[PDB]
């Protein structure tokens, strides 16, 4: 009956429009729409397979690195290349460090202001705020004096009359539930997060050559020259520099981010009871550690009917079960060919017809796995790891829940993870586990170099004739990413990307079934239809990236 539109949705990447039908004050139906297209799949066509990664990395600069690594993995798949183990270590360090930056920025810079009221922070007693965290965190930057400095920054900003990016936010909104002291704590951590994410990106830069957009990859390995005794190359001094930044990340992740996740949950417990996007979940394994593109540190898998006992593990990037299940349809997207297509047969022919609620309404295609809708991302990857009985994932989850229980006296069951907060918890768990990946892979690299292996690259043999098909999987910060390359007579004849936000933000599918964003919103109460904070909270929990979704 009552229809609202949110366009643009802010604090995401790219251009997203959300519509909701509201019945009796609650969302009864929703539409997600990506409103910008570039045609990156077409732009990369007819080129040397080796060129693709530099072009398609530009699908997105928020999740920089991801499309680059997926693209080289796709060409390596097509050409049957075994990546040298040193190149795996380097790719793994880059991906883990990037994802650390990515998750931190998402929780604080992109998401926190959905839950945090900066004007309420002005009312806080900084001494009280500090005392609240006594015995809750060991973080060294939670003093009343630190909180006072932060509070004065907010005061100065407000007093200036130029709130800028903080202007006209949901200050005073009924759904803002934190006490003033907790709002102040959150703003202090928001600012501290900026330093931590910078350190994570210094790791990425030292191996990538810069960030955003790394430039050290190759079909066949990496471009870093390993030589301990070389001037101007990747030597021991450079490796020590990389290690110095890796060592700076864990304290913030464990003592601030992990803790804030539980604190938010404690003050917003009903958000463990809404925002479910799907009953099926899919994740790819990640961080290969052998010389044959396998032996992943993280397992992947497929779960149906929100039931962990259905878990089907995926531990190979050439698993035909995974490869053969994936299709996309443009029944409700602005493309010409509407029947479901497997990506090796995919087309991307624009057919813009304007937004309509029962027709085509998005530039995002609707992917399916064996014809079903699936949620991807840190919730999917967490649930797969729990189902796989990975001790580290259980322990990390239990740590967050323990803080929650200390604050509330209540517990969190697996059933409650299928929710807006569960999704956020999955992301935090991922970030925590990635710190071990960084330490492990750095050490593996140092050890392997000591065994006399400086190999970083194997030259591809690209046949001048014949057809070759390849797919590169990657578990990106937002979920399972796959690039699909067909090579014919030495050049790219088809290229299709199916991106995690494509899965989550996709419009109604070939069977008219809603995607995760659209499903997650049904049931959401709206205090003010003019300022639908509650919608934005759930959508942000998926960490939308529309340049990724649409490409």
């Amino acid at each position: 009956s009552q229809r609202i539109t949110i366009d643009p949705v802010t604090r995401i990447e790219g251009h997203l429009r959300i519509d909701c039908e509201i019945e009796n004050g609650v969302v009864s139906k929703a539409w997600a729409s990506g409103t910008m297209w570039r045609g990156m799949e077409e732009i990369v066509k007819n080129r040397d397979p080796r060129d693709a990664w530099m072009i398609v990395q530009r699908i997105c600069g928020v999740c920089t690195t991801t499309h680059a690594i997926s693209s080289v993995r796709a060409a390596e798949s097509a050409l049957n290349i075994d990546v040298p183990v040193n190149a795996q270590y380097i790719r793994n360090i880059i991906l883990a460090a990037h994802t650390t930056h990515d998750h931190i920025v998402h929780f604080y810079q992109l998401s926190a202001l959905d839950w945090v009221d900066i004007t309420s922070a002005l009312k806080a007693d900084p001494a009280k705020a500090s005392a609240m965290l006594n015995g809750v965190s060991t973080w060294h930057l939670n003093s009343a004096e630190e909180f006072t400095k932060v509070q004065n920054k907010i005061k100065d900003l407000v007093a200036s009359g130029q709130l800028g990016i903080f202007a006209n936010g949901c200050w005073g909104h009924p759904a803002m539930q934190l006490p003033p002291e907790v709002n102040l704590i959150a703003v202090a951590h928001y600012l501290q997060a900026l330093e931590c994410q910078r350190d994570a990106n210094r790791v990425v830069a030292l191996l990538g050559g810069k960030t955003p957009h790394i430039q050290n990859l190759a079909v066949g390995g990496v471009a870093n020259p390993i030589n301990l005794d070389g001037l101007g190359v990747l030597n021991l001094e450079r490796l020590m520099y990389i290690k110095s930044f890796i060592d700076k990340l864990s304290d913030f992740v464990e003592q601030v981010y992990k803790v804030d996740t539980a604190v938010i949950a404690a003050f917003y417990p009903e958000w463990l009871e809404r925002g479910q996007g799907a009953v099926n979940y899919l994740s790819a394994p990640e961080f290969p550690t052998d010389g044959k593109n396998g032996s992943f540190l993280f397992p992947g898998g497929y779960i149906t009917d929100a039931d962990l006992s259905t878990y089907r593990p995926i531990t190979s990037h050439s698993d035909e079960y995974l490869i053969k299940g994936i299709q996309e349809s443009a029944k409700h997207a602005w493309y010409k060919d509407e029947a479901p297509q497997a990506p090796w047969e995919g087309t991307t022919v624009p057919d813009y017809t304007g937004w309509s609620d029962d027709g085509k309404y998005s530039w995002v295609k609707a992917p399916t796995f064996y014809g079903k809708t699936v949620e991807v991302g840190p919730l999917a990857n967490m649930l797969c790891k729990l189902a796989a009985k990975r001790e580290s994932t259980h322990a990390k989850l239990n740590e967050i829940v323990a803080i929650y229980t200390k604050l509330t006296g209540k517990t969190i069951e697996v059933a409650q993870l299928h929710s807006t907060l569960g999704r956020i918890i999955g992301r935090t768990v991922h970030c925590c586990e990635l710190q071990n990946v960084l330490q492990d892979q750095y050490n593996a690299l140092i050890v392997n170099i000591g065994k006399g292996d400086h190999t970083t690259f194997v030259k591809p043999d690209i046949p001048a004739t014949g057809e070759f098909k390849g797919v590169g999987f990657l578990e990106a910060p937002r979920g399972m990413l796959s690039h699909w390359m067909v090579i014919k007579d030495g050049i790219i004849s088809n290229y299709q990307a199916v991106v995690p936000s494509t899965w989550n933000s996709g419009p109604r599918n070939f069977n008219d079934e809603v995607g995760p964003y659209e499903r997650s919103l049904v049931g959401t109460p709206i205090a003010d239809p003019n300022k639908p904070l509650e919608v934005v909270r759930t959508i942000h929990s998926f960490d939308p990236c529309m340049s990724c979704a649409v490409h």
Partner: protein, 269 residues
């Protein structure tokens, strides 16, 4: 005291140019938005969304008419009457033209806004073009790169703020302090180039000695920028060539995203 207003509009962008600000150190992004400028509109960072954020934009465009710096990130798609980038139900080109009317200075940040960039490459599916093409009567300051070092942008803005005028620009309206010289004309591997010391394959002996990357496809000889000197991320010694990969020419129209990675700089096929 009041801070100078900046309005930032994203067209066909990947958000890499905004993300570059998160790596900046002088100023850091927090000092930028709290102390140096008033970021009046930016969709990535704004607390407000939907109707409220467009309200912020309108309010800013009126309140600071004649005084704001307009920054555009991304290419502008001309094909099919602008429908390939629609924000709040309107082609982005209309948002840009309206904002440009009251701008004190206009900056195209990134190669996409500067000259079309990756979105305009290949067959150019959306008819993407650079900002100057959309605003023919305006002086546009171009800060190319995919993305540029954030300080190429920040020092340009600082020059406007501190001395009241843009920095000196070249014939392509790029600031000379950052784009006034070819990378190859200030590259630390030039002695290797001169001597004939070239890497031929990643991981080979010359590559592992830090020799010149020309024969791997380095586009430094035809790319203007400061990548070899300012470099990236302020940790020292970090740019693509230093890491072991040739310059791809991402700053430069007709080089980046057009020439193959391993295509030589003197090869135009």
């Amino acid at each position: 005291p009041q801070r100078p207003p900046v309005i930032w509009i994203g067209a066909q962008e990947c958000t890499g140019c905004t993300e570059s600000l998160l790596r900046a150190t002088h100023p850091t992004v927090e000092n930028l938005v709290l102390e140096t400028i008033s970021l009046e509109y930016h969709e990535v960072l704004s607390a407000a969304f939907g109707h409220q954020v467009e309200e912020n934009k309108h309010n800013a465009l009126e309140k600071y008419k004649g005084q704001y710096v307009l920054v555009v990130d991304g290419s502008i798609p001309l094909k099919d009457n602008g429908i390939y980038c629609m924000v709040a139900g309107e082609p982005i080109v209309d948002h840009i033209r309206r904002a440009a009317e009251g701008a004190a200075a206009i900056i195209a940040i990134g190669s996409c806004a500067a000259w079309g960039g990756v979105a305009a490459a290949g067959v150019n599916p959306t008819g993407a073009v650079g900002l100057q093409e959309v605003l023919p009567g305006k002086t546009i300051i171009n800060i190319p790169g995919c993305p540029p070092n954030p300080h190429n942008f920040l020092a340009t803005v600082a020059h406007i703020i501190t001395y009241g005028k843009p920095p000196k620009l070249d014939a392509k309206n790029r600031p000379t302090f950052a784009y006034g010289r070819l990378i190859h004309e200030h590259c630390e591997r030039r002695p290797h180039f001169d001597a004939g010391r070239f890497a031929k394959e990643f991981g080979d002996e010359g590559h592992r000695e830090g020799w010149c990357l020309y024969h791997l496809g380095c586009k430094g000889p035809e790319t203007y920028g400061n990548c070899s000197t300012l470099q990236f991320c302020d940790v020292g010694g970090v740019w693509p060539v230093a890491i072991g990969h040739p310059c791809y020419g991402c700053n430069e129209e007709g080089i980046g995203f057009h020439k193959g990675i391993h295509q030589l700089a003197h090869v135009e096929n």
